[PDB]
Amino acid sequence: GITGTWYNQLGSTFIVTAGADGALTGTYEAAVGNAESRYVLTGRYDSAPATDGSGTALGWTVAWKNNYRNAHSATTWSGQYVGGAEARINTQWLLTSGTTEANAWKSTLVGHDTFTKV
Amino acid sequence: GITGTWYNQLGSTFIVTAGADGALTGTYEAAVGNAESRYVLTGRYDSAPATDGSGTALGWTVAWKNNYRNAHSATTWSGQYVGGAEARINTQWLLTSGTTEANAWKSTLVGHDTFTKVKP
Amino acid sequence: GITGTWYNQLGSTFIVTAGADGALTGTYEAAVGNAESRYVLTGRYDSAPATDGSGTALGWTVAWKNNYRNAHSATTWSGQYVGGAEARINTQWLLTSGTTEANAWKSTLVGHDTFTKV
Amino acid sequence: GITGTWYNQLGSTFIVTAGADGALTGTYEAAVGNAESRYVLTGRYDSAPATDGSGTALGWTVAWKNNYRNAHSATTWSGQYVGGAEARINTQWLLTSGTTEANAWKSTLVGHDTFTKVKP
Ligand SMILES: O=C(O)CCCC[C@@H]1SC[C@@H]2NC(=O)N[C@@H]21
Ligand SMILES: O=C(O)CCCC[C@@H]1SC[C@@H]2NC(=O)N[C@@H]21
Ligand SMILES: O=C(O)CCCC[C@@H]1SC[C@@H]2NC(=O)N[C@@H]21
Numbered sequence: 342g343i344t345g346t347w348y349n350q351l352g353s354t355f356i357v358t359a360g361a362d363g364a365l366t367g368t369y370e371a372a373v374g375n376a377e378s379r380y381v382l383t384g385r386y387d388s389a390p391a392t393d394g395s396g397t398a399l400g401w402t403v404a405w406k407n408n409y410r411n412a413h414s415a416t417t418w419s420g421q422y423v424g425g426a427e428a429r430i431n432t433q434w435l436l437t438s439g440t441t442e443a444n445a446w447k448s449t450l451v452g453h454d455t456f457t458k459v
Numbered sequence: 460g461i462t463g464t465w466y467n468q469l470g471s472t473f474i475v476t477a478g479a480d481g482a483l484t485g486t487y488e489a490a491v492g493n494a495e496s497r498y499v500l501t502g503r504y505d506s507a508p509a510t511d512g513s514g515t516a517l518g519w520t521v522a523w524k525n526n527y528r529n530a531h532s533a534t535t536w537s538g539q540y541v542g543g544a545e546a547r548i549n550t551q552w553l554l555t556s557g558t559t560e561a562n563a564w565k566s567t568l569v570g571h572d573t574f575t576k577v578k579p
Numbered sequence: 580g581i582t583g584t585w586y587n588q589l590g591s592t593f594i595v596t597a598g599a600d601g602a603l604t605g606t607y608e609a610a611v612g613n614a615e616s617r618y619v620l621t622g623r624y625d626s627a628p629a630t631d632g633s634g635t636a637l638g639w640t641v642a643w644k645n646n647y648r649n650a651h652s653a654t655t656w657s658g659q660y661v662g663g664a665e666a667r668i669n670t671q672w673l674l675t676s677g678t679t680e681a682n683a684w685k686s687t688l689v690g691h692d693t694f695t696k697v
Numbered sequence: 698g699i700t701g702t703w704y705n706q707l708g709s710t711f712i713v714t715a716g717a718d719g720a721l722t723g724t725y726e727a728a729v730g731n732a733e734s735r736y737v738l739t740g741r742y743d744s745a746p747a748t749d750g751s752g753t754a755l756g757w758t759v760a761w762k763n764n765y766r767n768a769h770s771a772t773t774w775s776g777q778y779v780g781g782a783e784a785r786i787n788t789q790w791l792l793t794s795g796t797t798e799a800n801a802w803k804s805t806l807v808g809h810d811t812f813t814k815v816k817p
């Protein structure tokens with residue numbers, strides 16, 4: 342359900358596997374920002390959701406270091422999986438950059454991504 | 460280092476290991492909310508931070524299901540580690556509950572947690 | 580440009596006037612939550628924006644008290660106006676409810692609204 | 698009350714008047730960022746809060762244009778006032794810069810400011 346390949350509105354690629362233990366594992370390729378190639382992602386999802394037409398709560402993290410570049414930053418996406426034939430993961434995110442203490446007030450960006458399954 | 464046992468301003472306990480190449484693995488025990496006992500967490504951190512005085516970017520996720528309870532929700536914390544005599548993890552977090560599509564506008568709480576290794 | 584009537588994806592109605600001094604004034608009618616009828620809004624916008632294809636920064640607040648109900652809560656929308664023939668105000672928001680100190684960790688909801696001019 | 702002169706943890710000065718029926722009117726002087734001197738602010742607050750111990754919901758906006766500078770940005774603070782011997786305004790804020798549509802994903806900073814009437 343969650344497992345598979347997804348793209349968001351920015352053109353980024355999310356490849357994820359949902360494990361029976363509630364683990365999310367995969368890779369993220371961002372189409373924008375201080376990024377190239379694939380980054381490891383790890384996260385968690387509700388592996389026994391409500392069956393009431395509620396989405397499945399999940400989240401994951403990328404630290405923007407790979408063996409090609411390092412942006413000294415990390416994003417977390419928090420959201421829910423909405424199943425069916427046109428599956429979606431609807432998220433909000435927090436992108437924190439490492440900063441000096443004096444600059445910490447401007448460390449974190451916030452946004453929202455919608456992911457479509459392919 | 461990041462590895463260790465941390466406490467936030469609500470009294471919740473964050474036990475984590477920082478793997479050499481960027482993993483965060485541990486458990487989270489919340490002192491408030493629809494939760495008891497420990498929950499699995501996973502995340503990532505910058506395993507080669509800048510050497511200019513900046514903190515270490517990191518984040519992690521908890522889905523609030525364990526053998527005791529299931530709140531049908533997940534929190535992600537996004538922040539940075541600040542080393543020093545009084546090491547600190549400063550975060551902002553997003554707590555998404557599963558909801559119907561309709562109620563999705565009120566699905567996500569936002570807040571901020573600071574962590575230190577000082578037991579309450 | 581900004582002045583006029585707007586609706587968002589939830590079906591809420593935003594009626595605003597942009598003053599020459601950078602003031603935003605108007606009324607908000609929410610289609611969801613603990614709300615009925617029109618609420619006062621006040622806000623600010625950049626009254627001398629960049630002319631570079633950058634949007635116009637703005638924000639506004641509603642306290643969810645009117646002479647019909649009171650939700651003991653307030654939303655702020657922060658975002659930018661994107662002009663032209665299909666004008667949009669793209670926003671993120673923070674909805675804080677009054678809470679006891681022990682409950683303050685769960686005081687604030689976050690989301691995002693897109694407004695279309697009519 | 699909410700009316701008065703407030704300072705946050707960055708040292709920025711928030712001078713506000715709470716109108717009887719819900720207005721917030723004042724000035725904001727930021728101690729960090731692309732700003733100097735005072736900026737106009739406006740907002741709203743709950744003029745009949747609950748009587749159970751809860752805080753007073755409020756919010757306000759600053760667009761960062763004044764006679765000295767224009768950062769082409771706006772911040773909104775959303776929070777609540779907590780009365781008591783050490784009154785406090787606890788907020789979360791969103792700072793949106795104008796950007797092209799393309800760069801809109803990195804247009805908005807989020808943070809948290811606490812305010813008290815204690816001068817730094
Ligand atoms: O610039 C950085 O520090 C690293 C890349 C950040 C890319 C961000 S993560 C949130 C948003 N969603 C995407 O697919 N890309 C951006
Ligand atoms: O209530 C739930 O849905 C699960 C528990 C949520 C606890 C939240 S996570 C953010 C904040 N930080 C904490 O230590 N606890 C709360
Ligand atoms: O429930 C409340 O406390 C008052 C109504 C809140 C309505 C919210 S404000 C953010 C979002 N955008 C809308 O048009 N409605 C909701």
Ligand SMILES: O=C(O)CCCC[C@@H]1SC[C@@H]2NC(=O)N[C@@H]21
Nearest residue numbers: 709727730731732761768770772
């Ligand atoms: O840099 C800008 O675009 C304008 C100044 C921003 C100052 C920010 S607003 C949030 C935070 N709280 C403060 O008192 N200052 C910063």
